Design a protein around this ligand. Structure first.
Ligand code: HEM
Ligand SMILES: C[C@@H]1[C@@H](O)[C@@H](C)C[C@H](C)C(=O)[C@H](C)[C@@H](O)[C@@H](C)[C@@H](C)OC(=O)[C@H](C)[C@H]1O
Length: 394
C-alpha cells in the first residue's frame, strides 16, 4: 500500500516514520517509485546486515526493468553494484589487492597539499565564500586523479566527465555521449601506457601481471577506473558539505574539533552514521531463496530495499542514536554499506573527509556559516542529499 519514499526530504532530518517502523514493523511492505510490484523495506541493523551480507540475496536480479527500484532508468547490468558472485567476488579480490588501506594512507601527504591549495584559493577570494565551489566540488575529483596517477595537464578532462555523468548536469546534451566516448578513449590510452611502463599509482598496480597469476583485463581496468570515479564523486562532494553543515549549525561541535584536532577521525565516523547521505533506500536486493529476517521471512523472488540511515539510528545498537556524539566507544555504522558491496572507496572517502575537516580546523578555527540557515539551498530532486551552496566566513 504505502509509497516509498514516504515524504520529500527536509535538510538532513530523518522521517519520523522510520523510528516507528523499527519499534512496530521492522520489515514493512512498500511501493517504490519505478518498478512493478511491492518490495520489503528493512529498517534495522541486524536485518540490513542479513540483506546486504547473505548470499541468498542477488543484486544482479534487480537489473530486470520489472523489478522495483528507487531511480527511473533500469540499472545497467555492467555496474559493479549489479554484479553477482563469483564474477563480482573476482573483481573485488583483484582490485582489493591494489586498493589497500596502506596505499590510501600513503596518499595523505599529497591530499593535505591538495586541500591546502584549494583553501589558499578561497582566502584569495576572501571571506565570505562558497565552500561548495572552492572545497567540496573540486577536492574529490583531484583526490581520485591522484589515486589514478592522472597527469596534471589531463585532469581538466576528468572534471568535465564527472560533471557530465551527474544527472543534475546543466549541459544535459546529446553531446554527453560524445564526452563519454572521448573520455573512454583517453582511459584506454592511459591503461595501455601503464601496461608499457609500470607506475606506482593504482592503475599501475592493476596493470602489473605476476604472469603466473590472476589479473584484470585491460578493458576491465578501464571500466573499473570509470566506476571508481563516478561512485566516489557524488557521495564525497555532498558528504563534505553535509559534515560541515552539522559542524556549524551546532557550532559547539566544530569548537570541539578545534579544541582537540585528534578527535577528527572519530567525529567523521559519527557524522557518517548520523548523515542520511542516501535519502532513499538502497540498490535493490532480490532473494534467490527463502530467508528469515527479524520479524518476517522473505520468499524467493521478493525484492528488498535497505535504508542505511535508519539502521544507523537503531536504538538497540546505539545509545542516544538521535544525538551526535564524538566520544562513542564503538561505532558499527553501515554508512559505507555492508557485505559484498561495501564501498571500495571506504578508506579514500574517510581520507577525503578527515583531511578536509583537519585542514578547515587548522586554517580556520573562526570558520562559520555566513548564509542564514533558513536560506540554505538543499538539492531537491536527488537520490543523495547535499547543499547547492554553503557560504562561510572566517
Ligand atoms: C563519503 C564517501 C562515500 C560514501 C558515503 C559511499 C557510500 C557507498 C555505499 C553505501 C555503497 C554501497 C551501496 C550498496 O551496496 O547498495 C557504496 C558502494 C561503492 N562505493 Fe562508495 N561511498 C563513498 C565514497 C566512495 C569513493 C571515494 C569511492 C571510490 C573511490 C567509492 C566507490 C564505491 C564503489 C565502487 C562501490 C561499489 C561496491 C561494489 O559493488 O563493489 N565510493 N558506496
Ligand atoms: C557508487 C554509488 C553508490 O554510493 C550508491 C550506493 C549510492 C546510492 C545508494 C545508490 O545505490 C543508487 C541507488 C545507485 O545505485 C543508482 C541509483 C545510481 C543512479 O546512483 C549512483 O550511480 C551512485 C553514484 C552509486 O553508483
Amino acid at each position: 500500500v504505502p509509497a516509498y519514499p514516504f515524504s520529500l526530504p527536509h535538510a538532513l532530518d530523518l522521517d519520523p516514520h522510520y523510528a516507528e517502523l523499527r519499534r512496530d514493523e521492522p520489515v514493512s511492505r512498500v511501493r517504490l517509485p519505478y518498478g512493478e510490484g511491492t518490495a520489503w523495506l528493512v529498517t534495522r541493523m541486524s536485518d540490513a546486515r542479513i540483506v546486504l551480507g547473505d548470499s541468498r540475496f542477488s543484486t544482479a536480479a534487480a537489473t530486470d526493468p520489472a523489478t522495483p527500484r528507487m531511480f527511473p532508468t533500469p540499472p545497467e547490468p555492467d555496474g559493479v553494484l549489479a554484479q553477482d558472485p563469483p564474477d563480482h567476488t573476482r573483481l573485488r579480490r583483484l582490485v582489493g589487492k591494489a586498493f589497500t588501506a596502506r596505499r590510501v594512507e600513503e596518499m595523505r601527504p599529497r591530499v593535505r597539499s591538495l586541500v591546502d591549495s584549494l583553501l589558499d584559493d578561497m582566502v584569495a577570494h576572501g571571506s565570505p565564500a562558497d565552500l561548495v565551489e572552492f572545497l567540496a566540488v573540486p577536492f574529490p575529483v583531484a583526490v581520485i586523479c591522484e589515486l589514478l596517477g592522472v597527469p596534471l595537464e589531463d585532469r581538466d578532462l576528468f572534471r568535465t566527465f564527472s560533471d557530465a555523468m551527474l544527472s543534475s548536469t546543466r549541459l544535459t546534451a546529446a553531446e554527453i555521449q560524445r564526452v563519454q566516448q572521448d573520455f573512454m578513449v583517453y582511459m584506454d590510452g592511459l591503461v595501455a601506457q601503464r601496461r608499457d611502463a609500470p607506475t606506482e599509482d593504482l592503475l599501475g598496480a592493476l596493470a602489473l601481471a605476476t604472469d603466473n597469476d590472476d589479473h584484470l583485463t585491460k578493458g576491465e581496468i578501464v571500466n573499473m577506473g570509470v566506476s571508481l570515479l563516478i561512485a566516489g564523486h557524488e557521495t564525497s562532494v555532498n558528504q563534505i558539505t553535509n559534515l560541515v553543515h552539522l559542524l556549524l549549525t551546532e557550532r559547539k561541535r566544530y569548537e570541539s574539533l578545534v579544541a582537540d584536532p585528534a578527535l577528527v577521525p572519530a567525529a567523521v565516523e559519527e557524522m557518517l552514521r548520523y548523515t542520511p547521505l542516501v535519502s532513499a533506500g538502497s540498490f535493490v536486493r532480490v532473494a534467490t531463496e527463502d530467508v528469515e529476517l527479524s520479524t518476517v521471512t522473505v520468499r524467493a523472488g521478493e525484492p528488498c530495499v535497505v535504508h542505511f540511515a535508519s539502521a544507523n539510528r537503531d536504538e538497540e545498537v546505539f545509545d542516544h542514536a538521535d544525538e551526535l556524539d564524538f566520544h562513542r566507544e564503538r561505532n558499527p555504522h553501515i554508512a559505507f554499506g555492508h557485505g559484498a558491496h561495501h564501498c571500495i572507496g571506504a578508506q579514500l572517502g574517510r581520507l577525503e573527509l578527515q583531511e578536509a575537516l583537519s585542514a578547515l580546523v587548522r586554517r580556520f578555527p573562526t570558520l562559520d556559516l555566513a548564509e542564514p540557515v533558513a536560506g540554505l539551498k538543499w538539492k531537491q530532486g536527488m537520490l543523495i542529499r547535499g547543499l547547492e551552496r554553503q557560504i562561510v566566513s572566517w
